[PDB]
Design a protein around this ligand. Sequence first.
Ligand SMILES: *[C@H](C)[C@H]1/C(=C/c2[nH]c(/C=C3N=C(/C=C4\NC(=O)C(CC)=C4C)C(C)=C\3CCC(=O)O)c(CCC(=O)O)c2C)NC(=O)[C@@H]1C
Lengths: 46, 273
Amino acid sequence: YSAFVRPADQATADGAAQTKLGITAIAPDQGVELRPNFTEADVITV
Amino acid sequence: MNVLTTSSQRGGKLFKVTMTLSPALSHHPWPSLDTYEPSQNSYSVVVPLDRLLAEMTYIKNKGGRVLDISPADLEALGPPDISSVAIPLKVELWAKADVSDVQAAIVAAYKQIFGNTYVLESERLTSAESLLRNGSISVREFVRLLAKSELYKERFFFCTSNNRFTELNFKHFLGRAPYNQSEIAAHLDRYQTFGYDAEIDSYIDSDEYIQAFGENVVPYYRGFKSQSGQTVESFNRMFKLYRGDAGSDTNLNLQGQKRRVDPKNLLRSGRGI
Ligand SMILES: *[C@H](C)[C@H]1/C(=C/c2[nH]c(/C=C3N=C(/C=C4\NC(=O)C(CC)=C4C)C(C)=C\3CCC(=O)O)c(CCC(=O)O)c2C)NC(=O)[C@@H]1C
């Protein structure tokens, strides 16, 4: 039951890899879908 | 649905296409299973003649199947003018009618009884016509004869389904379009046991037929104006049963006898049976 965890070496984390490429959230994409009933705003954003 | 432009930027004949949508065709951008939106269970696309081929292949390669294709020009045309049927006219055969007045009633009858549909001279019935104008037959009785005549059966009842024939009958005998599923049901049952003749008889016999143009008045379109005990949806149905003037109930046209009123529409107005 050591529960040695530890910081580890590389310490890259989730964020660092993508910041290295420089995607800065271009690679992750949230799709936008239109609806038959939609606010004009929702159309605008589209 | 209304289509806004009949032809595309480069000249082409735009065609509405209606398909039953499938999850592959359109899918939400959600985790979990792909689902096409519910409202677009039936989906209408408007496409130039050129892309049609490729558009449809793809729809059918997916689970989609094509409900119908209509030219956009025929579509996005006004609802038919109700001018003539808004106030029908009315034709009354007086006792001791002059030779001309009898002729008018006959012509009017053939119109409403057989719809726009043309009746050839050979088709026309001398004996029945003979009896009116000597007396002895009511306009109502003439009506009966005409429905009983083979001409009518060949057109309306023999080609189309009995579901078709009942509304077809309603319109001819009464202006009205059918209200509710129940009426359609009732008539079919009557046909099974009693046979054709009794069903025909019931419409003419019915009090509604008596209450408006009961005797010696050729039937006129009660539909397209408000009537007692008529569901609002019936009015809309009338527009489906009646397309324009010069538009007829034709066994002649391709797949000639079909349903003007979709069964779901009837169910909307009333259900219970
Ligand atoms: C479950 C209680 C009952 C049931 C449901 C059931 N539904 C389907 C298929 C679909 N149902 C829907 C509904 C929606 N899609 C949406 O996007 C939305 C709201 C935004 C709804 C509510 C749709 C579109 C489908 C068809 C396509 C799809 O699955 O996305 C089925 C299976 C039908 C099939 O062949 O796929 C079933 C079983 N049916 C039951 O058995 C219960 C009574």
